[PDB]
Point group: C3
Chain length 143, copies 3
Amino acid sequence: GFEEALELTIRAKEEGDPRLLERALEILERRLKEAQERGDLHLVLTIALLLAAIAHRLGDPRYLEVAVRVLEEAIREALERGDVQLVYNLVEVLLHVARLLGDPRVFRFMLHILLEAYRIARENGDEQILIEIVHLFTEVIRG
Amino acid sequence: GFEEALELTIRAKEEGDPRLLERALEILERRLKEAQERGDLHLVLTIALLLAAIAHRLGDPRYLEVAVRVLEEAIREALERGDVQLVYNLVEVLLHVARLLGDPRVFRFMLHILLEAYRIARENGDEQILIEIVHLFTEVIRG
Amino acid sequence: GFEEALELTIRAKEEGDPRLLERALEILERRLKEAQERGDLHLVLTIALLLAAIAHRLGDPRYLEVAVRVLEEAIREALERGDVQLVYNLVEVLLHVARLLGDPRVFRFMLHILLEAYRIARENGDEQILIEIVHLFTEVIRG
């Protein structure tokens, strides 16, 4: 499912044809909506990661903003689920995306989510993810 | 605890109040001494990492220094115990602190520790820790 | 002697003697020829990583090149073997040396290898590696 986007990315770099980046971003945007529906938040994680990395190469912040918005909604759902691990892995991707975009308010969103996920993990009693959340927190406050 | 620090960090981004960073640094410096005293080297790892990130923001090298001296003593104890994984994770944090602080001697300390941890890991199982030690070595020598 | 290279590397830092870097590079190049062809792609990964690190310190691109060419042939062999976890760990080290060397061509190599490994992993049905490959792919296209 990711193969066509990975090939198109290599093909756009070597041939210098940004229309191939745009084609792959279209494929990845279709897939990301299909996984946003259905509730496949683990796949949304990786599609949004790949979507944002290609969008960054193309120089078009629009697709970076779509990845942010979809990752933020997947985080809110995964936090309502009380999954915490999915929230952690979702925030990890959003951190890489926010680092690319440079939007300060995405980091603010992640600080609140991590604090809430720490509270769910504290009352659940999962110690290892409690530390993993604090570590991810120290990375967000950097920038 | 961690929750009060994470709340104060968020509260001091929202409210324009760096005193809340200072209050968090004070709590974490208390907890870090309490953890070093108890020998709680796994918590020493996470407190120092959070302390240094909150100290990097606000920009006070003092709390970076406390973090270096405590991590170093936690590393020496973990190396006495022969716990190659723990000293690996402890040096990993000290490398991030020392990169923030910029003191050459903190790197030199890490060079000698990793060589010793390589000897213990060589005579033990030649596991992934063996490559993880030499991998961490190459990162300490670089910058 | 792995330990000898670690010792010489520390020894060249505080004595400021780059002849010890060149001596460790000699020991590591002898060791890589022993390890390669015989196989042991895991040890090829370790010493090539150490070799290129102290070569970067020495300022000599030549040894960065042999670390690259040995890593690339290890990746091709591990890719022939079908060991997709091994090519992942090999490409991870090849990204660090490619960052040091600064040659655009090694990044092109890594993009093609990762696309292949995804295909082998997709037909093998490993799932977790497929995601880990895509995640590493987003790191390679950055730089």
